[PDB]
Amino acid sequence: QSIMQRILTVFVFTLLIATVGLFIGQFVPVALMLPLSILEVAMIILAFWMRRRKAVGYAFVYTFAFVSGITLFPIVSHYASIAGAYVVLEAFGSTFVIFAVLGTIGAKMKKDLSFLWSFLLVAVLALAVVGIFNIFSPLNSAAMMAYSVIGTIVFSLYILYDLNQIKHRHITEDLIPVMALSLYLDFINLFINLLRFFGILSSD
Ligand SMILES: [Gd]
């Protein structure tokens, strides 16, 4: 009925569409698979880009959710292989409770967190730079673990912020796709960071 529920209705469908993509993604051969470095940082770059995009439709978000799902399996399989499959469940479980807890608090809190926009914008740019640096010169385990905890905190704060702005701002019906897409990217980026963190933590 309300705009918040319609956004979260779209959000759940992108999760479902992504899960089918993830299943399909297992059949991609190693020849057609991009480097792990590139795949991880591309999601940070798209999270930044898709936030500032104008006039996004329902066809874009659902097709994006599907394709991104396919390009998530290489990362999932990597960290499951180096540290056991249990880290994928730990990562997904931790993402789900963080999103539920922070999403609920953000959506019903009386304080308006609009002032954080600049703080979170520069943090994503920093992660983007360090992620791009990682392609050419790969960071060691401890720097990657440090990078992962920081990314976890930034993308946890974005969920709080995003649900908070949905309540506090006058969101028109034409922004339902773009707001759900940002929730999807926040979720996916939080998952990747927890997965890498717990992946490396159990790696040695
Ligand atoms: Gd790998």
Curated annotation (Swiss-Prot):
Residues 51-57, 109-113, 167-176 are cytoplasmic. GO terms for cellular component: membrane; plasma membrane. The record marks 162 as: Important for activity. Pfam families: Bax1-I. Changing residue 186 to E: Results in constantly open channel with reduced Ca(2+) affinity. It comes from the Bacteria. GO terms for molecular function: calcium channel activity. Residues 29-35, 78-86, 138-142, 199-204 are extracellular. It is a multi-pass membrane protein. Its main location: membrane. The chain crosses the membrane at residues 7-28, 36-50, 58-77, 87-108, 114-137, 143-166, 177-198. It catalyses: Ca(2+)(in) = Ca(2+)(out). Keywords: Calcium, Calcium transport, Cell membrane, Ion transport, Membrane, Transmembrane, Transmembrane helix, Transport. Monomer. BsYetJ in nanodiscs is structurally different from those crystallized in detergents. In lipid nanodiscs, BsYetJ conformation is pH-sensitive in apo state (lacking calcium), whereas in a calcium-containing solution it is locked in an intermediate state, inert to pH changes. When crystallized in detergents it shows a pH-sensitive conformational equilibrium between a rather flexible pore-open state seen at lower pH and a pore-closed state seen at higher pH. BsYetJ appears to be a lipid-sensitive membrane protein: differences in membrane lipid composition lead to changes in functional sites. Belongs to the BI1 family. This is pH-sensitive calcium channel. It comes from Bacillus subtilis (strain 168).
